[PDB]
């Protein structure tokens, strides 16, 4: 009753052929359904019993398999195909795989950086949130490292990426440290150092309180 | 024709119970399981469980036996779905499924309920300035934006000088905060040579607490 889906994210072209796979811990069969799902909508049928397309679902997908791996195979890749994919074992149980988001392939690209310090604004309240941008970067794995008077924080930042974007297929990065007015005014030298596969070596963006 | 529509949005405290509902028509309702489904933020699908209209059978994922009840009427086709003990981690898009034609697989699903669970109450957003300046200038092409911070429940809109300009926007997703809070940030690059020309303001709109605010940001 575990479904698990390699690779979670594909990289490909219009009009290529792709081809995802889910593996159950145990034999199911021809139990398989495959649905596909964009953000913010409910998800969609494409295939059940493993190889059986959904009326109405374009011939270009297909699917088979049987017993513990399976695939979905997508011919000539549309536009509207890039979303993400999910197995899920229709036997006993229903359980769903991790899910694979097919993604706009294109060249590394490495990201802008860019820092924000806390506005008088905010500080007045009694918080600093200090705003780390990493803008139209791919692919989409990059890392961030808060540093303050050169301690790297942890746990006390959280950060968001986009979706793909529409007109260059990159990925920006938002990157948010915060920290209480009093320690805020308690440091000096506040710093984001950025990593991407597309960076030779780390990029740092920083600032001093009082600059 | 087949269609399931659910009740709407909810926001509840921990501990607290949520009981959603799921309309069913253009198929017999009783003669087919209603299934249950859930989806936390930019996660993936979940089974929760499943009944048999008629007799009120019921079967519940591993996790969530004890906490969930599924229920039917159908007298009036709809199905509901309780959750009790409350958590933040229950936060998620809560959706109800059937398969009409007995395909082996959710061929009709609901447009999805949105449940946030918080210790937070409903509350608007402060909004500060993501200031251009020389940290955030690259060639020709500057950075600003907005914080949009300490808000609940999801979802808030921002646009920039009312939907005029659109190029070079990037509007992030929300992290939810220790606090039970939510914050976002919204950003666009332009040209540094129209920073100190050109106006640039954020429209933000936070509908579950009818809080509305533009945001002028200057170098």
């Known amino acids: 009753i575990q479904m698990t889906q390699s690779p979670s994210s594909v990289s490909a072209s219009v009009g290529d052929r792709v081809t995802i796979t889910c593996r159950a811990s145990?034999?199911?069969?021809?139990?398989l359904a495959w649905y596909q799902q964009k953000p913010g909508k409910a998800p969609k049928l494409l295939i059940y019993?493993?190889?059986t397309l959904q009326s109405g679902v374009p011939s270009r997908f297909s699917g088979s398999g049987s017993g513990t791996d399976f695939s979905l195979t997508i011919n000539s890749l549309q536009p509207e195909d890039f979303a993400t994919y999910y197995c899920?074992?229709?036997?006993?149980?229903?359980?769903f795989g991790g899910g694979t988001k097919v993604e706009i392939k294109r060249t590394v690209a490495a990201p802008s950086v860019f820092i924000f310090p806390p506005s008088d604004e905010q500080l007045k309240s009694g918080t600093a949130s200090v705003v780390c941008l990493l803008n139209n970067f791919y692919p989409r794995e990059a890392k961030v490292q808060w540093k303050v008077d050169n301690a790297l924080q942890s746990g006390n930042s959280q950060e968001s990426v986009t979706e793909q974007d529409s007109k260059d297929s990159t990925y920006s990065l938002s990157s948010t440290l915060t920290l209480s007015k009093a320690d805020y005014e308690k440091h000096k030298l506040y710093a984001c150092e950025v990593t991407h596969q597309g960076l030779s070596s780390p990029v740092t963006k920083s600032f001093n309180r009082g600059e | 024709e087949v269609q399931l529509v659910q009740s709407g949005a909810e926001v509840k405290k921990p501990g607290a119970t949520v009981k959603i509902s799921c309309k069913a028509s253009?198929?017999?309702?009783?003669?087919?399981?209603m299934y249950w489904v859930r989806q936390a933020p930019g996660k993936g699908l979940e089974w929760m469980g499943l009944?048999?209209?008629?007799?009120?059978?019921?079967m519940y994922a591993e996790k969530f036996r004890g906490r969930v009840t599924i229920t039917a009427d159908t007298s009036t086709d709809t199905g509901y779905l309780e959750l009790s003990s409350l958590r933040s981690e229950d936060t998620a898009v809560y959706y109800c499924?059937?398969?009409?034609?007995?395909?082996?697989?959710?061929?009709?699903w609901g447009q999805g309920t949105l449940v946030s669970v918080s210790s937070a109450s409903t509350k608007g957003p402060s909004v500060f300035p993501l200031a251009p300046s020389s940290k955030s200038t690259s060639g020709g092409t500057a950075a600003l934006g907005c914080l949009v911070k300490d808000y609940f429940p999801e979802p808030v809109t921002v646009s920039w000088n009312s939907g005029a300009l659109t190029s070079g926007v990037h509007t992030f997703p929300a992290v939810l905060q220790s606090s039970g809070l939510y914050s976002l940030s919204s950003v666009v690059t332009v040209p540094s040579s129209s920073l100190g020309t050109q106006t640039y303001i954020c429209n933000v709109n936070h509908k579950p607490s009818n809080t509305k605010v533009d945001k002028k940001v200057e170098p």
């Open positions: 499924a059937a398969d009409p034609w007995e395909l082996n697989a959710f061929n009709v």
């Open positions: 253009g198929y017999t309702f009783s003669d087919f399981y």
């Open positions: 009944i048999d209209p008629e007799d009120a059978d019921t």
């Open positions: 145990q034999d199911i069969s021809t139990w």
């Open positions: 019993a493993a190889s």
């Open positions: 899920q074992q229709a036997n006993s149980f229903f359980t």
